[PDB]
Amino acid sequence: DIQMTQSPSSLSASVGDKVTITCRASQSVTKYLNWYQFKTGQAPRILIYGTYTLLSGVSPRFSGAGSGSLYTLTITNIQPEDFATYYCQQAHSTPWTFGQGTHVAANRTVAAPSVFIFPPSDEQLKSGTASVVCLLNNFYPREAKVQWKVDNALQSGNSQESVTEQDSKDSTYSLSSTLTLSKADYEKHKVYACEVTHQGLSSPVTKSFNRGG
Amino acid sequence: NWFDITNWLWYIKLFIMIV
Amino acid sequence: VQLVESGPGLVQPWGTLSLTCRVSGDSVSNDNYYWAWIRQTPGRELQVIGTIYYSGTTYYNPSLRNRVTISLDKSVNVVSLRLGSVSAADTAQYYCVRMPSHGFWSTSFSYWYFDLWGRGHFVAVSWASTKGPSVFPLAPSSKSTSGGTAALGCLVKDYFPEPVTVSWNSGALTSGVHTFPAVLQSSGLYSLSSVVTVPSSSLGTQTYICNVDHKPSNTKVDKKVEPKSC
Ligand SMILES: *[C@@H]1O[C@H](CO)[C@@H](O)[C@H](O)[C@H]1NC(C)=O
Ligand SMILES: C[N+](C)(C)CCOP(=O)(O)O
Known part of the structure; x- marks a missing residue:
């Protein structure tokens, strides 16, 4: 051949x-x-x-x-x-x-991402697991660092990432870092945070919530 | 199979076009 | 001229996998054309499975010749592919394709090219059984707001085999939508998310429904995504 x-x-x-x-x-x-x-x-x-x-x-x-x-x-x-x-x-x-x-x-040209965070759906907590999503929308270049911190500790293998193809008109990418956990571990901790570093950001950008209130 | 044959046939056809 | 391929989503190992391509422009006995099957493996490699003609003659790629058959079904204008003793390495996108037959006196004799391609059809080959996805809302909050626009979505978790198709507001919503590629979880099942950014003012007036389809398990799900008031 x-x-x-x-x-x-x-x-x-x-x-x-x-x-x-x-x-x-x-x-x-x-x-x-x-x-x-x-x-x-x-x-x-x-x-x-x-x-x-x-x-x-x-x-x-x-x-x-x-x-x-x-x-x-x-x-x-x-x-x-x-x-x-x-x-x-x-x-x-x-x-x-x-x-x-x-x-x-x-x-x-460089474009900083807008960062969003999603706690787990009540429906999903009933099922017994908890997924929290970090979304990085419409940025360029493709390289972006996304670290998860739970009560100030970094998460190792807790999360998976996914990246869209380049937008046809925008010419930019978006990325989801979803961190998946047992309902156990999620009920344990309080402050869930997603930290983002990217060119065209001067300081790392953090989005966080408190479990519950 | 017939595909590969067309490879040679092209030259045959050229030989013909000349005459 | 239209080419619509179809077949099963998932095939058991050691089975025989059959696809059919319905040809919507002209007759398959047109004899100005051959018809062919070409496939792409995950990993982007293109393999050309077979060649056929109105007269009945077939060409098969040597590495498959022992176990493939292509044929025309003239009465309904379809071209069929059967592939037997199928393994995991047959997981691929399968395209149906048209090829001009240029005759001896044609200016372009002996030039062989694939001039028209179908959209493709994916076939997973696995011992694993089908499994539909669960759909969970990704609700907008102040935590998923940036300036004037809010982000929202729905999580499509734990399904096999690929693929899932996701739409928003039944197709009426197609602006700023990002449904990501799937990821293979540790469990061996797939999951993705689909997210749209809308203007925050539009929550509380516009409903946002996400429509998931998973044909291998005949799953259709419509999950409504409601605003939170963080
Ligand atoms: C993009 O264009 C700029 C122009 O200065 C160049 O410096 C840079 O290397 C280019 N990068 C890529 C990825 O093409
Ligand atoms: C004949 N051919 C077009 C297939 C290749 C050779 O052409 P040329 O090299 O004589 O131009």
Whole structure:
């Protein structure tokens, strides 16, 4: 089977920049090389076939090039609707094989997150466990530190995190740190707090409640 | 299978277009 | 031309997994097209399962050839995939796909590309049994307020297998909504949250209902989220 590798695996770009994606093959594929666009929300979509040819309805910003074992896709004036992940595929040999994919995300100006905190639902306390959610809304860059403190102690493995994909228009991320506990431990303590550090915050931001009142 | 054959057929067809 | 794939959500190991793709534009015996199945594994790798033609001829990827069959059902315009002796490594998104057959004198002869793709259909393969989610409100408070806007949500906890679909106000609410990806808990079950930010003034006038769907266990749940007055 012909092995395929794209570079870079991930990159990020500002609207307007030129973006080039390189696809190298283990053999020569003699120009039988196709490019596809994958966005969350829509079905995968071809844009080029046989190295150079554009399909109807694909914008001419996209352009293909190459020969032998080395081809290259180029996005000329990258637009908000172009941020997505792109795959190359070889049609040369019997078992057709794709690349691993190049994820192209947006560069954007710093944005501090707004922090929210949710205590556990009464319904959920009846069930016998307690989940408390910390929400970090609409920030950039992706790197954010979220520490949990219960009566001033840090929590170890108590919590799980999750992060959205980049917003199509906002170009920003949101993140949930949910800390899960037995009803026992939750009834034990008083002051539950969520501390956030992020670039574009000068001081760490803390949100806290007291169990009950 | 037929797919791989078209690989060679293209050159056959070129050989033809010349003549 | 429309392509709608369908099949089961969860399949038992050593079973045979069947998917069907209903083709809504032209006939599958069009003979200008082949039809194919391509799948993506968690981990983003694309594997091309099979190739078929109106005449009956099939191509199968060698690593699967011993245990896959594709066929056309001309009378209802569907293309079928059967995959037997299925294991955990068959957990994937399964796409139905169209492919131009360019004839000998076509300018673009021997150029083979997948020109139209369905939306996909996910299949989990597990010994574990189906399990619907519990839905708990994430109620707005002063603790979930920042300036003029309040945040609220609902927690979708303890379900298997993936995926769950979440909407707000029955689709009428689609502004600032963030339903996160699932996380695999220690228990081996999945859970996520769905959250929306609205203007705080709109609590007490606008109702906010979250609508969860989990087709593998036939679960539909509507949980109403009420403001707290912290
Ligand atoms: C974003 O653009 C700025 C422009 O100065 C650059 O310094 C920075 O390295 C870029 N970051 C990314 C992630 O592209
Ligand atoms: C014939 N081909 C287009 C498949 C590859 C070779 O073309 P060319 O290299 O002669 O331009």
